[PDB]
């Protein structure tokens, strides 16, 4: 989920 954020961001 942290990743997710990480990566989009």
Same mark, same amino acid.
């Given at each position: %989920? &942290? &990743? &997710? %954020?990480?990566? &989009? %961001?």
């Amino acid at each position: %989920l &942290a &990743a &997710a %954020l990480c990566q &989009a %961001l």
